[PDB]
Design a protein around this ligand. Structure first.
Ligand SMILES: NS(=O)(=O)c1ccc(Nc2ncnc(Cl)c2[N+](=O)[O-])cc1
Ligand SMILES: [Zn+2]
Length: 258
């Protein structure tokens, strides 16, 4: 009976195995755009993905991860609200059973169809496992998806999904360029938060882009054909794998833009 997204094991049950679920800096949150203060001391975000080396893609029974070789100084995030240098390790998405829901962060209570999380760890901690034990260990770049025009840079991911339908399947996935998933503008909101799945560690500087990317109805439909279950088990569609907004408590969301 491990955690997941259903009635019996979904977000509202997680605190029993993971008591930090009811912590002081949990994610995601609603971003109230009127209350986020513009901070002229914030820097432009620096996203340097030209040398990113993807290795594999994995269905882990909760989402799919595109994993990167983070053994060398390649794909890094810096500037913005960050001190120092954070190295890309993986990305994944959260999405809905319908276009009206699926994101984890919301914007003035608006839910997007999906949300992409590019996950990076602070190089001052040597690796991801050590980094997740620190309050400034991770920087997650969140990008909203809406349904409209197709995103050509996503199609390579969409096409491999039918090869990792069920929990525990993986496939080599080299030469994928995550620059093709970024919107034009790097305007963002930032706040201190946590992982949005167990173990729900309070180790993340969240950077949430204001500009969503558009994906087609056919692309998001293929996300929804994934399975939470493993091969030879009764089919449970991988949909609604998002955590709802959590209490903001004693936090300020900052805006990089007027
Ligand atoms: N949804 S989120 O907040 O972006 C988020 C949530 C959980 C994780 N967990 C991990 N991510 C990468 N590798 C490992 Cl090895 C783990 N892990 O902890 O298993 C990463 C990102
Ligand atoms: Zn995530």
């Amino acid at each position: 009976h491990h955690w997941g997204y259903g009635k019996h094991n979904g977000p509202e049950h997680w605190h029993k195995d993971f008591p930090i679920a009811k912590g002081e800096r949990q994610s995601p949150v609603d971003i109230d755009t009127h209350t986020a203060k513009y901070d002229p001391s914030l820097k432009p975000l620096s996203v340097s993905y030209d040398q990113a080396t993807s290795l594999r893609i994995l269905n882990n029974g909760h989402a799919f991860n595109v994993e990167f070789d983070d053994s060398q100084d390649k794909a890094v995030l810096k500037g913005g609200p960050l001190d120092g240098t954070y190295r890309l390790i993986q990305f994944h998405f959260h999405w809905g059973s319908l276009d009206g829901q699926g994101s984890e962060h919301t914007v003035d209570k608006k839910k997007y169809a999906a949300e992409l999380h590019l996950v990076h760890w602070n190089t001052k901690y040597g690796d991801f496992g050590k980094a997740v034990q620190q309050p400034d260990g991770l920087a997650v770049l969140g990008i909203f998806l809406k349904v409209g025009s197709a995103k050509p840079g996503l199609q390579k991911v969409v096409d491999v999904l039918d090869s990792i339908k069920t929990k525990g399947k993986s496939a080599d996935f080299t030469n994928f360029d995550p620059r093709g998933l970024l919107p034009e503008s790097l305007d963002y909101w930032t706040y201190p938060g946590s992982l949005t799945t167990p173990p729900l560690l309070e180790c993340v500087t969240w950077i949430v882009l204001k500009e969503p990317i558009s994906v087609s109805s056919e692309q998001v439909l293929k996300f929804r054909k994934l399975n939470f279950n493993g091969e030879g088990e009764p089919e449970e569609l991988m949909v609604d794998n998002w955590r709802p907004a959590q209490p903001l408590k004693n936090r300020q969301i900052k805006a990089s833009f007027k």
